[PDB]
Amino acid sequence: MDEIKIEKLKKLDKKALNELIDVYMSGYEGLEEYGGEGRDYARNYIKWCWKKASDGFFVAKVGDKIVGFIVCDKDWFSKYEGRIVGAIHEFVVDKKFQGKGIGRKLLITCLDFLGKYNDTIELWVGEKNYGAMNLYEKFGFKKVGKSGIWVRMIKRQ
Amino acid sequence: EIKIEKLKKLDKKALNELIDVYMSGYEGLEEYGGEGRDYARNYIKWCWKKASDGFFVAKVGDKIVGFIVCDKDWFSKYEGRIVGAIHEFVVDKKFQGKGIGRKLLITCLDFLGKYNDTIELWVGEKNYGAMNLYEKFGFKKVGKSGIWVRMIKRQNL
Ligand SMILES: CC(=O)SCCNC(=O)CCNC(=O)[C@H](O)C(C)(C)COP(=O)(O)OP(=O)(O)OC[C@H]1O[C@@H](n2cnc3c(N)ncnc32)[C@H](O)[C@@H]1OP(=O)(O)O
Ligand SMILES: CC(=O)SCCNC(=O)CCNC(=O)[C@H](O)C(C)(C)COP(=O)(O)OP(=O)(O)OC[C@H]1O[C@@H](n2cnc3c(N)ncnc32)[C@H](O)[C@@H]1OP(=O)(O)O
């Protein structure tokens, strides 16, 4: 059938950005409280993620279309850990492609990538996002703090 | 650093290195006593003959420290069709807990994913460490025969 290919996004052209935005909007539908409203919010955040961590921008593809992506930052400073750590800035899969193990593949790819650089991985997830938190805990992430509607999770080597 | 590559030839050097890894991971095959290496040798040769194109090794320098045997042509009567299979997967104890297994499994899934939508494997009933790792990669327990548990990873449409 169709292969789920995980690869580093080589470049963020208007075309790729458009696809990422569609995936983002699709995946965050219903979770606007955390994903923001409108394609503009998505466009700006994705561009920021690319500028900050293009080296760890992985996309899941089925054919010629991107169906999900994860942004891994090997150079993130955490005031909580008081040092440079790994971070996941974004992680989303097209709604139509969710529940098929694609997110799992992206997360494993992320852990393998960051594992070469950091002994700690930090992330923030919405407090109502029990689904994402369940996935993270299954991979060793633990809740360690909060900030408003956001929960901080960490994984140590 | 760790390097993952397809084994191109099962020569004397590679074979003895593979036996060393196998013996380490399976704590010496003490039931066989002085013939332990002979049993490991014959099994490795069998794996190589049956699935050489999916025989990957992890190397630290010029020495093999781990390996995985991926079979893209395994008939499973349980699934009632040809599926992908993992015959063996082991990392030298001195090199375990460093992400080598994860790298080998990612390589395995990438390889088999080009041919099969289903991957089957059998693991010891008390091998909680391996089962945990397989479950993180999407494998699910689906059966048992004697002291062996059958696990399957099936990609959904
Ligand atoms: C740093 C952050 O970016 S936090 C923000 C994370 N992103 C989002 O919330 C955006 C919206 N959600 C998504 O895009 C996706 O649901 C993701 C990325 C969270 C998960 O990816 P998916 O491809 O849907 O999941 P995948 O099919 O690989 O399976 C994920 C596993 O995690 C868990 N999981 C995922 N979603 C849920 C859920 N809604 N409820 C319960 N468990 C869940 C399960 O253990 C599941 O395994 P299973 O199928 O064996 O039960
Ligand atoms: C089809 C079959 O072949 S079944 C036979 C499977 N093989 C065997 O039983 C042989 C003996 N075992 C081995 O050789 C190895 O332990 C393997 C191949 C199972 C795993 O390889 P490894 O290189 O050790 O594991 P790797 O380092 O990639 O990651 C393993 C994960 O397992 C657990 N683990 C491994 N070491 C530790 C540790 N020191 N502390 C805590 N958990 C650990 C964790 O869940 C670890 O977490 P992470 O993923 O968050 O880092």
Q: Which resolution in angstroms does this entry have?
A: 1.8
Residue type, position A156, single letter: R
At B67 the three-state DSSP class reads strand
Q: Are A155 and A78 in contact (CB under 8 A)?
A: no
Kindly state the DSSP code that residue A101 receives in the 8-state scheme: S
Structure tokens, A80: 């909580």
Query: At residue B122, what are phi and psi to the nearest 5 degrees?
Result: -125, 135
Q: Where are the domains of chain B?
A: 1-157
The two three-digit tokens of residue B148, written as one number: 């062996």
Mutate to test the interface with B, among A5, A108, A114, A156 (most CBs of B within 10 A): A108
- Reduced to 3 states (helix: H, G, I; strand: E, B; else coil), residue B60 is strand
d(C-alpha A39, C-alpha A19), whole Å: 11
The rounded distance, in Å, linking the Cα atoms of A79 and A133 is 22
Contact A126, A90 (CB under 8 A): no
Residues A110, A117: Cα–Cα separation, whole Å:
11
Fold of B1-157: Aminopeptidase (3.40.630)
Instruction: Tell me the torsion sign for CA atoms B16, B20, B26, B28.
Output: positive
Pair B131, B123: CB distance under 8 Å:
yes
- Is residue A31 in contact with ligand 1, taking CB distance under 6 Å? yes
Asked if B157 has any chain A CB less than 8 Å from its own CB, the reply is: yes
Q: From CA A52, how far away is CA B77, in angstroms rounded?
A: 50
- Residue B80, sorted as left (phi over 0), alpha (psi -120 to 50) or beta, turns out to be left
Through-space distance between the first and last CA atoms of chain A, rounded to whole angstroms: 37
Q: How many residues comprise chain A? A: 157
* B113 and A CB contact within 8 Å: yes
Separation in Å, CA B102 to CA A40, A111, B75: 37, 10, 26
With a CB-CB cutoff of 8 Å, which residues 70-89 of chain A face chain B?
A: none
In angstroms, the CA B106 to CA B90 distance is 14
Question: Is the Cβ of A4 closer than 8 Å to some Cβ of chain B?
Answer: yes
Q: Amino acid identity, residue B63?
A: K
Q: How far apart are CA B110 and CA A96, in angstroms?
A: 23
Token code pair at residue B42: 């014959």
Atom of ligand 2 nearest to the CA of B100: 23
Residue in chain B nearest A116 by alpha carbon: B99
Residue A117: Cβ-neighbour burial (10 angstroms; 0-12, 13-18, 19+): middle
